[PDB]
Amino acid sequence: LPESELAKYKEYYQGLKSTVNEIPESVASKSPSLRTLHKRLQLPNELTYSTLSRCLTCPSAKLPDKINNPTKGAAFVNTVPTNKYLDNHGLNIMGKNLLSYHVTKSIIQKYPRLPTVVLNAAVNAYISEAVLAHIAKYWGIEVETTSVLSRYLKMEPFEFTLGRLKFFNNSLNSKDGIELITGKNFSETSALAMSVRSIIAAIWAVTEQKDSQAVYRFIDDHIMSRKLDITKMFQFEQPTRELAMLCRREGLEKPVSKLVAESGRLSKSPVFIVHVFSGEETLGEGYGSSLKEAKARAATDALMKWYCYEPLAQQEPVIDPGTVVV
Amino acid sequence: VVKAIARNSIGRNGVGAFVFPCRKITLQFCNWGGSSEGMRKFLTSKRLDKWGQEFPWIQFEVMRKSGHPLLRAEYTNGREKVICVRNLNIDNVENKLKLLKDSDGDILRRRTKNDNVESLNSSVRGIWSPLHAAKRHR
Amino acid sequence: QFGFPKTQVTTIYNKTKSASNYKGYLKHRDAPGMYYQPSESIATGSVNSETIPRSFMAASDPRRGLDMPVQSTKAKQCPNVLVGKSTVNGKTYHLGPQEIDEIRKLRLDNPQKYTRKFLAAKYGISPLFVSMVSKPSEQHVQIMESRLQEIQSRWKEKRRIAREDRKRRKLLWYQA
Amino acid sequence: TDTTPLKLSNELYAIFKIHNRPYLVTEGDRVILPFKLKQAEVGDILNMTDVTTLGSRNYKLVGHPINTSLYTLKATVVGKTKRAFQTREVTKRRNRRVRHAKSKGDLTILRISELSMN
Amino acid sequence: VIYLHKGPRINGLRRDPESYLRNPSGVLFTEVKECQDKVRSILQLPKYGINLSNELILQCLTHKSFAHGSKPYNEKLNLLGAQFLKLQTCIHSLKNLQFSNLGTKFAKELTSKNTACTFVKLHNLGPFIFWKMRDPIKGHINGETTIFASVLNAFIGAILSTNGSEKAAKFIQGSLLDKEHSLVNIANENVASAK
Ligand SMILES: [Mg+2]
Ligand SMILES: [Mg+2]
Ligand SMILES: [Mg+2]
Question: In degrees to the nearest 10, what's the CA dihedral of E100, E104, E109, E112?
């Protein structure tokens, strides 16, 4: 037996594992994918390539007993056991925290008096898991969907592996339409989200002292730049009552809906225009096919105006008296 | 009461930062095959190196396969253009590559007359109303 | 205030006969400077700053002093629409605790004799208020529910669909 | 020219003209120019030095190239791609030969990144 | 016969306004400046240069339950504060570069509402806050701890709103001195270990 192929393969595997444990800097530098990623997002140069690699590495300590059932749906043959002290697990949390803070703050700045539920929804939209995954995909953080054996056969260096995202992905997970339902740890989207968070965390770490706001700026460029129409987030129960309550709370005369213009009464499709007056100051215009509908619309409009108020930067930070409660 | 109905944010590539649309380009060629001569020449000629130097945010794979020569390119949105550069010469190949790089991945599509802008922002001014017109009709 | 010249969205062509034609608008050009162009449109779905009323701005925002959520309509003229009687003639808190208790008792006892309307008539007070005060015997409620169900069942196919559509419309009309 | 009510508004639109072709945009829009740019590459940024009209809901500044001092409107180039390929078939009415007239014109795609008062 | 019911409950009538505007301490919401000053002193707002309006302070103090949220609420600020606070705690953990200290018990304790409540109690800021007891005699079962936590968070939120981030961070650092929030956290951790 001139060639012990099992031995060579084993050696290769060991080497790969070692690299993962280390994430040597030289190896990271050699990786093209990582380099490309770095250039793409215009990351600060203090951020090393090892760090980047780490960010793409999700915590995979011990292979589950779910592997032993490929006959029962799942098989995990792509990943290699990660170092416990060198995963993205810590970074990820930090990133998440940052996202929670900063995005929320931004939203508040944009829209004081935004009903808490609505605010929460907005936040979710900005930084939900799915959205984060999408962002990651866009960036180009690809997943390691190639078995270690396959890689060995190909004869690709470890640099490529480092460049790819690494977690316990179920090879053979959606074949013949069968999907093994597992925890959050084994989903691709979640992994992507984590990676995204980790990148942010890394950035923060590098630029905590030289330029504290850099991270925030980056986030704004990437996360806060995304369009979300806040008007599309609301849904009112009986808004008239709420409006009245609001008026009572503030120094306003009781609101009254009044007919401003009307056309096509006695028809399939009429148009009624009703304003909700508070003395003289019109508080909400509302159109409708019926009178009732129009009234409702007016109320809704008023509520929207009250809530989605967006004050300028030259103003002194406005703080609302919470949400109206009835 | 106020209830929130869920939604998600839409990405606008250029408003904050700008992610570069093209990510990977795979120069595919063959040692044997006259159709792949220009491609081979291009690969040889330091032009590739120059390109790499120019555009470091995009990675250049270099495969060896038995068929015609290709330039498969992979974009942010996910889509993949693929140009077979059968029988082209160096300069033409380079031009093709340039074209690939320039494009965003998006699919080709017929535009109508004067359909220029594409917004997802509600009109600054309102949508016209007959009742809120400055001039009434008759 | 501002002393700007004001204008309609002008067309070089006849507006009455050719308002949809974009080209005319493009052709038109006006003398350089500022202009006031009142929006030819309702402000229902809008969240624009020039749409918000002064009462909903904070007492500091410069926009308060400026004049572009114009009060074009006057509340004196506009008829009250779908308003409660308490709004036209102010609310009353005349009714005591004993009276309330009595009302509640009555409700508990005989809902069909002492229905909400009747109660209202008796005590010069709103049916809504009565409802708020007092829950009727649950049996009555159950019966009512049953009746409603029966009525629903009695519907044809088309009517059900129509009802559903109406509901959907209603739901929509609180989005804005 | 008193430009305060444009300054104060949150929503704002502009009508800039590239080669006299007017495009009416807000921030975040994607303008599809019907030609290939040679000056700008992908990722470059264009400051619009011809803006016919800036407008809020109720006020609008106007003028033949209004001062670059007053505003900042800058678009980033995203894509240079062509519009879909077509073969319109040209022929007369008793003549068997046909002239296939091919067409695949080129587009430049911008994104209005900044649109603000200065 | 404008009867503004003042008794236990009828489930319908509007009360006399001056019946539900008195907190468990007794003070009338309308009454209170001295209180605000005292609160400021307790905080140590001067030193870090944290200027807050009295109104803001009052808002921070009060809670949803008081006056059915008719007077300034509290909640948004609290929410903001909590988000900020968690981040701050994480950063502190990182400082005291290694990332294997975050998902631990101590950190959780530091974050938590109970800890915050305890801190507030220690400070002696409980008399000032406006809220309503679920049942006047029953102590934390009325949901006091949570309210206290919210108030703490609300303060932080308010400071953030007034002063751009750095100041807030400084304040947090001051609060969490090992010489002096984190000393309470340690105690909490110890207690947990014991049980
Ligand atoms: Mg005509
Ligand atoms: Mg002939
Ligand atoms: Mg012919």
Answer: 80
Name the one residue in this structure whose structure tokens are 């306004």.
E17
How far is the C-alpha of A30 from the C-alpha of A160, rounded, in Å? 9
On the 0-12 / 13-18 / 19+ scale of CB atoms within 10 A, C94 is exposed
Chain B: closest CA distance from residue C37 (Å): 9
Question: Cα(first)–Cα(last) distance of chain E, in Å?
Answer: 60
Hey, which bits of chain C come out as E strands? 33-36
User: Could you tell me which of A294, A302, A284 has the C-alpha nearest to residue C82?
Assistant: A294
Specified resolution (Å)? 3.2
Distances, alpha carbon A298 to alpha carbons A325, B132, C41, C167, in Å:
19, 15, 15, 19
Q: Which strand (E) or helix (H) includes residue A287?
A: strand A281-288
Residue with tokens 């402000």: C43
Where are any strands of DSSP class E within C16-145? Answer: 33-36
Residues in chain A closer than 8 A to E79 (CB atoms): 104, 116, 119
In angstroms, the CA E24 to CA E127 distance is 8
- Alpha-carbon span A136 to A143, nearest angstrom: 11
Question: With contact defined as beta carbons under 8 Å apart, do D14 and D54 qualify?
Answer: yes
Q: How was this structure determined?
A: cryo-EM
Cα–Cα nearest to A302, from A248, A240, A251? A240
**Angle between helix E144-162 and E75-95 (nearest 10):** 80
What sign for the dihedral angle of Cα A207, A213, A219, A225? negative
Tokens encoding E97: 């570069």
Give the full edge-to-edge strand order of the sheet including B22-29. Answer: B59-64, B22-29, B70-75, B80-84
Question: Which ligand places an atom closest to the C-alpha of D93?
Answer: 3
In chain A the first and final C-alpha atoms are separated, in Å, by: 84
Distance (Å) from the alpha carbon of A18 to chain B's nearest alpha carbon:
26
| Cβ–Cβ < 8 Å for B44, B94 | no
Cα separation, E43 vs E174, in Å, equals 10
* E66 secondary structure, DSSP code: G
Residue indicated by tokens 């229902």: C44
Instruction: Please say whether the beta carbons of B125 and C41 come within 8 A.
Output: yes
Dist. CA D66 → ligand 1 center (Å): 34
Q: In terms of Cα–Cα distance, which of A33, A18, A25, A30 is closest to A163? A: A33
